[model samples]
Target: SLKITDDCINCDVCEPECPNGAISQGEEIYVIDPNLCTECVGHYDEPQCQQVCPVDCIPLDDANVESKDQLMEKYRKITGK
Candidate 1:
């Protein structure tokens, strides 16, 4: 899943590229719904949004985390259903 940092600029550049439509523009910053975020597993080697972030506000949710296969399964679930 994607985690937003305090450095978020809210420029809205990251919302469009999410294939699963996980990212949403919020009141002050962008939010990535954990239920929707697959980290672009089936489509990209890495999350394109996180890779493209200018402020580097997004990072791995290390505390509530999953492995690569788990993330891929999440991606498949989100995309398949």
Candidate 2:
């Protein structure tokens, strides 16, 4: 799971790096759609946005934690692959 907090600098560096298009520019900060985010499970071993974030704001959402298998299933659901 993922959530972009108020710490986000809105650098726009992470938006395009999300393969699921989960990151968006919010009014005051960047946003990440947890429903669409599989923590880059289907696309990459690591979350691309997290790796590229300049401010290190894209942290795993401990509030919405999920197992890796669940993430993989969600990834399959999203991509239909």
Candidate 3:
């Protein structure tokens, strides 16, 4: 799952570009619903949001952390790939 920062300009661009539909524009900063993020796990090599992000507000949730395996597991749940 991902979390966006206050640095977000509310560009409303990151959501559509996300392969996982995890990103959403907020009143101030864009938000990432962790349960839905899957992080583009099984599908893409890296987080598509970060790749397309111009401000780089999307970053790992270092507080609520998970391992690569766990991420893959979530990915498998979403993609079964």
Candidate 4:
């Protein structure tokens, strides 16, 4: 999982690359849905949001840490494939 910080410059560039539709603009800033975020495990090697972010605002959700295997499971669940 990941969370956009207050430092988020709102480039609005991180939404498209999320394979699970996890990122979006909330009331104040872009937000990542924890349930849908698999840290890009099932899709890309690195989280696409992190790669494409210009301000380096998105960071791992330390509060919701999970292993790669666990992330894969979440990804499978989200895609249902």
Candidate 5:
């Protein structure tokens, strides 16, 4: 899972970049849905949101960590692939 920290500037660049539609506007900043996030494992080589984030606010959520294999499994479940 990935999380948007307080460093986020609300630039709104990450929301559309998520391959899984995991990012959205929160009360005060952008948020990433842990259940929907697969870190782009099945869709791309890297996390698209992180690639485009200007402020580098998106970071791996240690409390909600997933391995690469687990992420791929999650991606398959989400995409039905």
Candidate 6:
């Protein structure tokens, strides 16, 4: 999973780029839903939101850390693919 830190610029770039629809507008910054996030494992080589984020605020969530294989499983469960 990924997290949008306080450094987020609210540029609205990462929200739409998220493959799992995990990114959303928060009180003052964008937020990434850990439940739905798979770090683009089933879709792209890298996290789409991170790739397009202007401030590089999106970072790996240590609290929600997951392995690639775990993310892949989650992706399949989420998309049924």
Question: Each model's TM-score?
Answer: 0.89, 0.95, 0.84, 0.95, 0.96, 0.96
Cα lDDT tens digits for candidate 4, 1-81: 888889888789999989999999988889999999999997999999999999999998889988999999999999996
| Sliding window of 10 residues with minimal summed lDDT for model 5 | 11-20
TM-score of 2: 0.95
Off by over 4 Å in 1: none
Error of 1 at 68 (Å): 1.1
Model 4 lDDT, residue 70, Cα: 93
| Candidate 3 TM-score over all chains jointly | 0.84
The alpha-carbon root-mean-square deviation between model 6 and the true structure, to one decimal in Å, is: 0.6
* Clash pairs, model 2 backbone: none
Candidate 4 versus truth, CA RMSD in Å, comes to: 0.8
Sliding window of 10 residues with minimal summed lDDT for model 1: 60-69
Shift of residue 37 alpha carbon in model 2, Å? 0.6
| Top-lDDT candidate index | 5
lDDT tens string, model 2, 2-77? 8988888888999889898998898899998899999999899999998988888878998889999999999999
* TM-score, cand. 5 vs. native: 0.96
Q: What are the RMSDs of all candidates, in order?
A: 1.4, 0.8, 1.5, 0.8, 0.6, 0.6
* Tens digit per residue, CA lDDT, model 1, 1-81: 877777899888888889989888887888888888877888888789987789998998775487789888997787784
Stretches > 4 Å off in candidate 6:
none
lDDT of 2 at 67: 93
Over the stretch 30-81, how does candidate 3's per-residue lDDT look in tens digits? Answer: 8888877777777778888888778998888876587778888877776666
Better of 2 and 3 by lDDT: 2
Error of 2 at 26 (Å): 0.9
Worst 10 residues of 2 by lDDT: 50-59
Q: Quantify all predictions' global Cα lDDT against the true fold.
A: 0.83, 0.90, 0.78, 0.92, 0.92, 0.91
Report the Cα lDDT for residue 8, model 3. Answer: 85
